[PDB]
């Protein structure tokens, strides 16, 4: 796929926003997905413990793994599509150390687009998140493309 100039530019005036608190919407997002798909918290060792969501809430780990991840997946959305380098590393770990079947990182683009719509109605009205679901799909399409060469996908 290939998003235009302005899809982009509505992905990354929200991400903008999202940036004035990483932790806080790491928090919010990995919450989001421990609840909603309690399978898929299974894949974290770290995390395995944690039985409700004031303890989500209170891990200052969790936190830290979220800011982890946002500050990846936000290098990879400034990109606009060129983002070939930075996902090689990351599809080489999930796929074949952690094991992350596609259909977890369906869940958590879901989790991302609940938590940007409660947090960010402003600047996430329904063109904004097509534009974001429309960049998470080429995410996904081209981290698929990549397990497929290393030899997992799925
Ligand atoms: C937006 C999608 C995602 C991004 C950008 C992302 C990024 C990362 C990064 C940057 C790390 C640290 C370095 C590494 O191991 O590669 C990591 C570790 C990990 N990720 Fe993800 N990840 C994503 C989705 C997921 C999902 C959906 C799962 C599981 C349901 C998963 C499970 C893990 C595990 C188990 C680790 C190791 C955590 C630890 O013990 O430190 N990741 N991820």
């Given at each position: 796929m290939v998003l235009s100039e302005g899809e982009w530019q509505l992905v990354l005036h929200v991400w903008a926003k999202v940036e004035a608190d990483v932790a806080g919407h790491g928090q919010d997002i990995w919450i989001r997905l421990f609840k909603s798909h309690?399978?898929?918290?299974?894949?974290?060792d770290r995390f395995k413990h944690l039985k409700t969501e004031a303890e989500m809430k209170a891990s200052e780990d969790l936190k830290k793994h979220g800011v982890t991840v946002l500050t990846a997946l936000g290098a990879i959305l400034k990109k606009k599509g060129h983002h070939e380098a930075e996902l090689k590393p990351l599809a080489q770990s999930h796929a074949?150390?952690?094991?992350?079947?596609?259909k977890y990182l369906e869940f958590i683009s879901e989790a991302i687009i609940h938590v940007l719509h409660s947090r960010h109605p402003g600047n996430f009205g329904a063109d904004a998140q097509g534009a974001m679901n429309k960049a998470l799909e080429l995410f996904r399409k081209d981290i698929a493309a990549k397990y497929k060469e290393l030899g997992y996908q799925g």
């Open positions: 309690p399978e898929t918290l299974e894949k974290f074949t150390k952690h094991k992350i079947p596609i």
